Design a protein around this ligand. Structure first.
Ligand code: HEM
Length: 137
């Protein structure tokens, strides 16, 4: 289930973080606008780019924690808060999160792994709601 998926991702975090985020950026290339130096690079170039490594690990280690601290896929208010008032997220609206979660769930469903894909969809849904209740668009 959801709890195990967190352990699965943590076990191989670097690889899952890069592959999922690459799935995200390839599905929605215009989302690169928030990162900038991402454009003009293939998957392999991004995987070796220092900042992409840093960005993806920071996104996914915290994502796993927000997931882990949640109850029945409902995030803590404090976790929604950090995500909203992060200076790095000043350009974001809830739709950016929705798109990340479309890609992530699509990745899990296509994978040769027993992910609880439906829970990650539900978690994405609840996180958008919590982000909006803390202030997004
Ligand atoms: C729930 C999923 C997400 C989590 C847990 C998360 C968390 C984080 C964390 C921990 C950082 C590092 C902040 C620091 O340097 O201290 C970060 C940076 C950043 N995040 Fe997110 N984030 C998420 C979703 C997103 C999405 C969907 C986008 C846009 C598509 C985004 C855009 C950014 C950007 C642009 C940065 C700054 C990278 C830089 O230094 O240039 N985040 N995020």
């Amino acid at each position: 289930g959801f709890k195990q998926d967190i352990a699965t991702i943590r076990g191989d975090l670097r690889t899952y973080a890069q592959d999922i985020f690459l799935a995200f950026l390839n599905k929605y290339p215009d989302e690169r606008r928030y990162f900038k130096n991402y454009v003009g690079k293939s998957d392999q170039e991004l995987k070796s780019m220092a900042k992409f490594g840093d960005d993806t690990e920071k996104v996914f280690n915290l994502m796993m924690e927000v997931a882990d601290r949640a109850t029945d896929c409902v995030p803590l208010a404090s976790d929604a808060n950090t995500l909203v008032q992060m200076k790095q997220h000043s350009s974001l609206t809830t739709g950016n999160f929705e798109k990340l979660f479309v890609a992530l769930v699509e990745y899990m469903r296509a994978s040769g792994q027993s992910f609880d894909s439906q829970s990650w969809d539900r978690f994405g849904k609840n996180l958008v709601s919590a982000l909006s209740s803390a202030g997004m668009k």
